[PDB]
Amino acid sequence: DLCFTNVYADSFVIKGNEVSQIAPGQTGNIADYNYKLPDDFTGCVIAW
Amino acid sequence: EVFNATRFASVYAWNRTRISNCVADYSVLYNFAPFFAFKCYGVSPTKLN
Numbered sequence: 112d113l114c115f116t117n118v119y120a121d122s123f124v125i126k127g128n129e130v131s132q133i134a135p136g137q138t139g140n141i142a143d144y145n146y147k148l149p150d151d152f153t154g155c156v157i158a159w
Numbered sequence: 160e161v162f163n164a165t166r167f168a169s170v171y172a173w174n175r176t177r178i179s180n181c182v183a184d185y186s187v188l189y190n191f192a193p194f195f196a197f198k199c200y201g202v203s204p205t206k207l208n
């Protein structure tokens with residue numbers, strides 16, 4: 112029920128705990144030097 | 160020496176140690192443990208040094 116201007120899909124395979132590591136305003140070896148999400152992140156993460 | 164220990168005492172008698180007059184750089188605790196929960200309350204872990 113939503114309309115979006117632009118939609119971005121960033122894909123990457125990672126460990127299990129790093130899935131919980133991925134969240135806005137987080138920290139970790141991956142969250143600090145590999146992939147940091149915006150503090151005002153408008154979206155979400157899919158992990159299977 | 161507090162994360163390199165081998166006999167962390169039981170919860171019924173918890174072992175308390177004091178740290179003073181030194182330089183606290185927390186990259187050592189960051190790389191010395193496969194962290195599962197870092198829920199800090201008083202100070203955010205990020206800019207902790």
Ligand SMILES: *[C@@H]1O[C@H](CO)[C@@H](O[C@@H]2O[C@H](CO)[C@@H](O)[C@H](O)[C@@H]2O)[C@H](O)[C@H]1NC(C)=O
Pocket residue numbers: 160161164168174175176
């Ligand atoms: C809690 O764990 C500490 C780990 O460093 C212990 O500190 C050491 O204790 C030894 C004696 O056991 C000292 O020789 C050493 O200098 C250092 O202080 C500490 O003793 C321990 N406390 C309890 C109550 O077990």
Ligand SMILES: *[C@@H]1O[C@H](CO)[C@@H](O)[C@H](O)[C@H]1NC(C)=O
Pocket residue numbers: 162163164165
């Ligand atoms: C200190 O940590 C290292 C690496 O984690 C380990 O190999 C060593 O056995 C530890 N020392 C003691 C006394 O447990």
